[PDB]
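From: lab user (bench 3)
To: helpdesk
Subject: output format question, protein + magnesium ion

Hello, I'm new to running complex predictions and I'm not sure whether the block I got back is the full result or only part of it. Here's what I submitted:
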Amino acid sequence: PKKVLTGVVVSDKMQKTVTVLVERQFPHPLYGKVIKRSKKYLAHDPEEKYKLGDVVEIIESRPISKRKRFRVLRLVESGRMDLVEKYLIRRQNYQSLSK
Amino acid sequence: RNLSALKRHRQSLKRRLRNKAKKSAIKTLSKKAIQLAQEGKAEEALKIMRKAESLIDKAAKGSTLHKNAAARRKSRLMRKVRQLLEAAGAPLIGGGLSA
Amino acid sequence: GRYIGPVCRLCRREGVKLYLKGERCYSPKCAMERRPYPPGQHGQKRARRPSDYAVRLREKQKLRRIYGISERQFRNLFEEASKKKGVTGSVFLGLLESRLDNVVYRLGFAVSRRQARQLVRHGHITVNGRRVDLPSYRVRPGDEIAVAEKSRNLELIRQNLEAMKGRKVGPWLSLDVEGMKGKFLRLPDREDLALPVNEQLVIEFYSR
Amino acid sequence: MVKIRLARFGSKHNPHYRIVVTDARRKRDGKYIEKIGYYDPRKTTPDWLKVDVERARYWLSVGAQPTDTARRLLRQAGVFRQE
RNA sequence: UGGAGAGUCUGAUCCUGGCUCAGGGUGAACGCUGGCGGCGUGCCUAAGACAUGCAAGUCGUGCGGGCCGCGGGGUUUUACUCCGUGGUCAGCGGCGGACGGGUGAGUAACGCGUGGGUGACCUACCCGGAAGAGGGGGACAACCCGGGGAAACUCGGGCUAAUCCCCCAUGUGGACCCGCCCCUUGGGGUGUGUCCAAAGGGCUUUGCCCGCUUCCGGAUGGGCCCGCGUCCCAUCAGCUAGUUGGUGGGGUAAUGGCCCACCAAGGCGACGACGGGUAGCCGGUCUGAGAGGAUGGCCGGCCACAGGGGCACUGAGACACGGGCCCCACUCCUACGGGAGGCAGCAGUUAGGAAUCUUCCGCAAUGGGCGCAAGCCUGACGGAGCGACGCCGCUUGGAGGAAGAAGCCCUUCGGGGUGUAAACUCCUGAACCCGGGACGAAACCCCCGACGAGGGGACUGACGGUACCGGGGUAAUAGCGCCGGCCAACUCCGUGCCAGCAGCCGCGGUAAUACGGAGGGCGCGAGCGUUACCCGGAUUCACUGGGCGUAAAGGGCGUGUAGGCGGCCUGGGGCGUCCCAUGUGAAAGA
Ligand SMILES: [Mg+2]
Ligand SMILES: [Mg+2]
Ligand SMILES: [Mg+2]
Ligand SMILES: [Mg+2]
Ligand SMILES: [Mg+2]
Ligand SMILES: [Mg+2]
Ligand SMILES: [Mg+2]
Ligand SMILES: [Mg+2]
Ligand SMILES: [Mg+2]
Ligand SMILES: [Mg+2]
Ligand SMILES: [Mg+2]
Ligand SMILES: [Mg+2]
Ligand SMILES: [Mg+2]
Ligand SMILES: [Mg+2]
Ligand SMILES: [Mg+2]
Ligand SMILES: [Mg+2]
Ligand SMILES: [Mg+2]
Ligand SMILES: [Mg+2]
Ligand SMILES: [Mg+2]
Ligand SMILES: [Mg+2]
Ligand SMILES: [Mg+2]
Ligand SMILES: [Mg+2]
Ligand SMILES: [Mg+2]
Ligand SMILES: [Mg+2]
Ligand SMILES: [Mg+2]
Ligand SMILES: [Mg+2]
Ligand SMILES: [Mg+2]
Ligand SMILES: [Mg+2]
Ligand SMILES: [Mg+2]
Ligand SMILES: [Mg+2]
Ligand SMILES: [Mg+2]
Ligand SMILES: [Mg+2]
Ligand SMILES: [Mg+2]
Ligand SMILES: [Mg+2]
Ligand SMILES: [Mg+2]
Ligand SMILES: [Mg+2]
Ligand SMILES: [Mg+2]
Ligand SMILES: [Mg+2]
Ligand SMILES: [Mg+2]
Ligand SMILES: [Mg+2]
Ligand SMILES: [Mg+2]
Ligand SMILES: [Mg+2]
Ligand SMILES: [Mg+2]
Ligand SMILES: [Mg+2]
Ligand SMILES: [Mg+2]
Ligand SMILES: [Mg+2]
Ligand SMILES: [Mg+2]
Ligand SMILES: [Mg+2]
Ligand SMILES: [Mg+2]
Ligand SMILES: [Mg+2]
Ligand SMILES: [Mg+2]
Ligand SMILES: [Mg+2]
Ligand SMILES: [Mg+2]
Ligand SMILES: [Mg+2]
Ligand SMILES: [Mg+2]
Ligand SMILES: [Mg+2]
Ligand SMILES: [Mg+2]
Ligand SMILES: [Mg+2]
Ligand SMILES: [Mg+2]
Ligand SMILES: [Mg+2]
Ligand SMILES: [Mg+2]
Ligand SMILES: [Mg+2]
Ligand SMILES: [Mg+2]
Ligand SMILES: [Mg+2]
Ligand SMILES: [Mg+2]
Ligand SMILES: [Mg+2]
Ligand SMILES: [Mg+2]
Ligand SMILES: [Mg+2]
Ligand SMILES: [Mg+2]
Ligand SMILES: [Mg+2]
Ligand SMILES: [Mg+2]
Ligand SMILES: [Mg+2]
Ligand SMILES: [Mg+2]
Ligand SMILES: [Mg+2]
Ligand SMILES: [Mg+2]
Ligand SMILES: [Mg+2]
Ligand SMILES: [Mg+2]
Ligand SMILES: [Mg+2]
Ligand SMILES: [Mg+2]
Ligand SMILES: [Mg+2]
Ligand SMILES: [Mg+2]
Ligand SMILES: [Mg+2]
Ligand SMILES: [Mg+2]
Ligand SMILES: [Mg+2]
Ligand SMILES: [Mg+2]
Ligand SMILES: [Mg+2]
Ligand SMILES: [Mg+2]
Ligand SMILES: [Mg+2]
Ligand SMILES: [Mg+2]
Ligand SMILES: [Mg+2]
Ligand SMILES: [Mg+2]
Ligand SMILES: [Mg+2]
Ligand SMILES: [Mg+2]
Ligand SMILES: [Mg+2]
Ligand SMILES: [Mg+2]
Ligand SMILES: [Mg+2]
Ligand SMILES: [Mg+2]
Ligand SMILES: [Mg+2]
Ligand SMILES: [Mg+2]
Ligand SMILES: [Mg+2]
Ligand SMILES: [Mg+2]
Ligand SMILES: [Mg+2]
Ligand SMILES: [Mg+2]
Ligand SMILES: [Mg+2]
Ligand SMILES: [Mg+2]
Ligand SMILES: [Mg+2]
Ligand SMILES: [Mg+2]
Ligand SMILES: [Mg+2]
Ligand SMILES: [Mg+2]
Ligand SMILES: [Mg+2]
Ligand SMILES: [Zn+2]
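Helpdesk reply: Thanks, we reran it on our side. This is the complete output you should expect:
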């Protein structure tokens, strides 16, 4: 099987490419509570179809570039920007905690 | 000292000159063909193209290009001479290409 | 090389008669007769209340010395019993009882354990027709332990079997006295052994 | 080229072989494709040779090449008998 | 089927708390001691340097020769010359030098593990199937001639063969452009057009064996991609310029910023980016009641490297340990111009180090390369040698023998101990002697049969005359630690805060069960102790399985970001969760 993930597009700013954020739930191997990790994939969008906030399936695919091995399967849920807002805020906290 | 596996090296430099020669013809013919496709000579360009192709497959016969590498160069060459022939097309000889 | 030296001194140090001397552990010379106290200068002194460790130590020694074995084979046999299915306590005893030297002694071929060991070592023992010179050879049930016909005419074998006439044998053993045969019928049970030894104490000596 | 040969699994002075399908280029005691038999040359047990003929015949339909000795032991177990 | 605790803070107590010990392990080393055998194992440090010898070749059934020799021819004789044959040497050519052997340096990484993708691919030799091999042409070695150099070697001229090279043809078929069909990433079919095949050799020479060409499939090995997992430092917090993406192009077997041009301004980070330290990873191994910790030697799988750094060539395959070029450092030769090297292959040397082996035998076995085969090579391998380094088996006697010798030790001077221990009696018979004496070995090959099935037959040893068997046969190494508590074993004398013991608590300043010796005893025994290191005890980093009023520990307080967590009813979904089937989980180990 080609691996297929479902996530939320958090980046529009490339050409023919969208960044998809994919959560993941698993029990901690020692302490056992369910922890939530998440990874960003650069997915190929040949038609510039999918926009920000879309919830899209992403399929293991023949390599397009460095850092691009997935293509956008289809659209699951259109435009829920609350997810994007959580990601943006979290990005934004990093401006503090330096100096 | 003095392994006669050295014989191998002596043959290496033989084949190096064989391979190196045929490739140099390929390139020098390929360019030639394209030069006439860009310059709108159709009959001459196709005449030369057939010789290029023949030289390619003949180099595939041996250990120079043995794989689909020869097919690569053919593909790219036929594409380039057809498209360059698209400027005031008139495919006179029509030998190398298909209708 | 097993323990070689004065033995009827360990008779004393354990506090129980150890028949490793064979005969004369029966005639009133065993030194367990009119000398039941342990050896040494302080033997006749009042002994102190032993530590809990001391008890399991003297019980393990009391068994080990009885079978005449190095600590090495002793512990390897024990751990073998700890792994095998069944009661570690009685499995160990069945395993010690299965030593070819011990069987030889037990079949009345030899006066003592040590004598049985030498008799095995010198190949005087048959097992299912084959010579076996290892005192450690594990006897299985159904094995015929005989005497090599080469040695059947030897006067020590005829000497011992002469006193074995009409003597009764362990319920897991049987022997033919004329043809100098013998057979290991089955493993002995706890009740099949009169060993003045508490197995639980030994098991409890190896938990540490 | 894939080959059918022996792999020594006994100990010193006690060889036991595993008739084995492996790439000719791997070690003799290295990773093989399939164990298709054993060989005891000192013949210590009643059964000192087992083959599973119909699997060997597979590996021969696809061109595994047996050793002279592998072929000796295979023939002995009747891999080639066609009557 | 599995879980033990103890000593030490106080005058005494309870608690907290660290330290220490008993257990197990080791690629070990050190001290004393040391009899035999089997199976394992043996540079952990300088990936420091290496003398010497061996470690990859093979094919005369692809081809033409040089040297040395013999025989037979054409001739009346000579000269010259033709054919056959033997030994040897390389050369041209083919297959193998990418396997196998070594190391652990680099690497924190798709490197490894694990599960997948390849519509993005390659695979010599091997297997199955389809089809074909017609004609012509050429060159470079060897050889011969000449020049340069001390050498390594090198330059020029001429002849020549081939399974070397090339042109034409033949088009089963394959490749490329374009179109159409079906599929759906570059998968399959089809049409026109263009392009592409080849080699001979051997005999039992009319037929067959070894080869050759194109294509499809198989099998095997491999490339590339992805999900997940993979040590420490946050006293490393910001990183990034091919950097992130795009269009086109180059390259490759093949995707891909892999590279290039141009365009956009992106990408990564507190879920730890970036930097630093450390390090091959795994199957496993050790420990532990387990959860866990520790580790990755030997063996198996993957990777990386071959004095350091870069690079390509040949090739199915390498960017190549025993191939090539270049830079650097080092050793050697040097006619000072210039050359040759590369044990982390097997042994061996030196250095360092607490420490790690034989410059051994063998092609008999298994395995690998070349070969129709005969056969050749194989420090892979099979064996031997050394080392108690580990494990295991085994010996230094067995039975009788005094209410109990001598010597030694203690004593209430009666005696007690060493102790059935010795002597001594009888029995057996490790060593050693003699003779016999292996399995591992049956194929390749030959013959019958068709070079098949099948039948038959013949040669084939390192270990080794070793194992083993049979006969004969001698009483024939014991050591080391410990004896204050934990901890099993006690007295005498010597010594007097001395000499010294000591894991911890502590012993010794005149009666020391602690020092030193002796007698005696305990514990193990061809070993026994010691040091180092790992786990355990340690619930002492507490998931299992701890805590914070006074013992170490509540942030000086708030507000609030991220994150964590979420009252009652119903319905959809089925992500976590639970069940079934199935593939996987290599071999070894357990
Ligand atoms: Mg966009
Ligand atoms: Mg791209
Ligand atoms: Mg920032
Ligand atoms: Mg050659
Ligand atoms: Mg040119
Ligand atoms: Mg190439
Ligand atoms: Mg048990
Ligand atoms: Mg019974
Ligand atoms: Mg325990
Ligand atoms: Mg391989
Ligand atoms: Mg049959
Ligand atoms: Mg239970
Ligand atoms: Mg106390
Ligand atoms: Mg206090
Ligand atoms: Mg005190
Ligand atoms: Mg305590
Ligand atoms: Mg324990
Ligand atoms: Mg220890
Ligand atoms: Mg010595
Ligand atoms: Mg050995
Ligand atoms: Mg090293
Ligand atoms: Mg180590
Ligand atoms: Mg030699
Ligand atoms: Mg003549
Ligand atoms: Mg003739
Ligand atoms: Mg000749
Ligand atoms: Mg010749
Ligand atoms: Mg030659
Ligand atoms: Mg090489
Ligand atoms: Mg290798
Ligand atoms: Mg390794
Ligand atoms: Mg780093
Ligand atoms: Mg990774
Ligand atoms: Mg992976
Ligand atoms: Mg994988
Ligand atoms: Mg010619
Ligand atoms: Mg010519
Ligand atoms: Mg030459
Ligand atoms: Mg010339
Ligand atoms: Mg020349
Ligand atoms: Mg050719
Ligand atoms: Mg056709
Ligand atoms: Mg066509
Ligand atoms: Mg043609
Ligand atoms: Mg020709
Ligand atoms: Mg594959
Ligand atoms: Mg591109
Ligand atoms: Mg290549
Ligand atoms: Mg650029
Ligand atoms: Mg993350
Ligand atoms: Mg390292
Ligand atoms: Mg365990
Ligand atoms: Mg525990
Ligand atoms: Mg590790
Ligand atoms: Mg690890
Ligand atoms: Mg090593
Ligand atoms: Mg390097
Ligand atoms: Mg290098
Ligand atoms: Mg090749
Ligand atoms: Mg190289
Ligand atoms: Mg390399
Ligand atoms: Mg070398
Ligand atoms: Mg000089
Ligand atoms: Mg030194
Ligand atoms: Mg060795
Ligand atoms: Mg010799
Ligand atoms: Mg061999
Ligand atoms: Mg061979
Ligand atoms: Mg062959
Ligand atoms: Mg050689
Ligand atoms: Mg070897
Ligand atoms: Mg020593
Ligand atoms: Mg005696
Ligand atoms: Mg006698
Ligand atoms: Mg044999
Ligand atoms: Mg035989
Ligand atoms: Mg015939
Ligand atoms: Mg036959
Ligand atoms: Mg042979
Ligand atoms: Mg011999
Ligand atoms: Mg004998
Ligand atoms: Mg005698
Ligand atoms: Mg004696
Ligand atoms: Mg103890
Ligand atoms: Mg005590
Ligand atoms: Mg001391
Ligand atoms: Mg005094
Ligand atoms: Mg005194
Ligand atoms: Mg005092
Ligand atoms: Mg004392
Ligand atoms: Mg002491
Ligand atoms: Mg003392
Ligand atoms: Mg003493
Ligand atoms: Mg031993
Ligand atoms: Mg030791
Ligand atoms: Mg510890
Ligand atoms: Mg713990
Ligand atoms: Mg602590
Ligand atoms: Mg601690
Ligand atoms: Mg606590
Ligand atoms: Mg206080
Ligand atoms: Mg406090
Ligand atoms: Mg407060
Ligand atoms: Mg405070
Ligand atoms: Mg709720
Ligand atoms: Mg929630
Ligand atoms: Mg519901
Ligand atoms: Mg579900
Ligand atoms: Mg399963
Ligand atoms: Mg397994
Ligand atoms: Zn007694």
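A quick orientation on your result: The longest helix of chain B spans residues 6-38. Let us know if anything else is unclear.
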